[model samples]
Target: MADQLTEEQIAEFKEAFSLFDKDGDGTITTKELGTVMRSLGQNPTEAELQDMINEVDADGNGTIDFPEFLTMMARKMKDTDSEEEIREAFRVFDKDGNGYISAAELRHVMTNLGEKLTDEEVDEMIREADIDGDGQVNYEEFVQMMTAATKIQASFRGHITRKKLKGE
Candidate 1:
């Protein structure tokens, strides 16, 4: 993982891992994982579950121990928190994959996510973040806006510390 997780993040993932380690054996068998996946309405085939095990089975013990699970989660967190992930999220609003998100595209996606927005609200969103004055949001503008609203800066200390994102 590129960065270490905060204790809070580690604890959250640990709690999730425990839910999958059905027998409290400090390890998760393929069967245990599959059962939990199915409970979550994700029907993973045995082959799929095996593939997951193969990815994180550091000890090659045919199962995922707690440490192995933590490592896997840490790696997942790193990937999920990367700028690439944010860019991919931006692509979701760029409906035609045209590299820029038009106002209509934004309105459509926002409407699908919740209540339909007034034309004014959609225009306001573009005005606030569309720094290029191009009437559409390019990837750079989108990334700049999202990072400003999400990533927190903090001092390194014994306890976790996080300053609010800019403009929050």
Candidate 2:
């Protein structure tokens, strides 16, 4: 399953791993992990950090190497929900209770919510996902879109998980 990760997924993980490995020593210590987690708004205790390190440190060296990080992420990916969560997101975008998300709805959600994306960017996003040339994102098309943007979806899931873990 470790080899199942795509290049994009590994590249994203590499970027996150580098951020956690503050000293650039190619390994993440418990201190580094805790610092980075805190910076990302996760307030894990010292014992929790040590426990995490112990879980991922395959060599018993007390640090997480790139391979170990990949292993950890792969396991997490396996545990995460797939289509059920994607369908929930689709429901969120389909505000009119219709079966699909129109360009206007997508633009509204994107602009009003997380990032204030440009109209051009929003149109471009729709263009890429509206595979049937209908200018709207149906559930299947939305699934394809989410699957294609797995890296972003994974990060969003991580964000949600962190927030939930924080009791928010």
How high is each candidate's TM-score?
A: 0.48, 0.45
List, residue by residue over 1-168, the lDDT tens digit for candidate 2: 735757897789878888888796798887888988888888998788888778778688888888888777777676465655666666656889887788877677545556545777668777877654678878777777665344556643554444345643
Worst 10 residues of 1 by lDDT: 152-161
| lDDT scores in order | 0.67, 0.72
Q: What's the distance in Å from true for residue 158, model 2?
A: 22
lDDT of 1 at 21: 87
Q: Runs in model 1 with CA error above 4 Å? A: 1-10, 82-168
| lDDT tens per residue, model 1, 1-168 | 455768987788678888898787777888988999999988998888988888888679898987788777777677655555455556566868887888877677656656445767668768886664678877777766654222211111101111112212
**Inter-residue clash pairs, candidate 2:** none
TM-score, predicted candidate 2 vs. hidden true structure: 0.45
Which 10 successive residues of model 2 have the least lDDT summed? Answer: 155-164
Q: Which residue runs of candidate 2 sit more than 4 Å off their true CA positions?
A: 2-7, 82-168
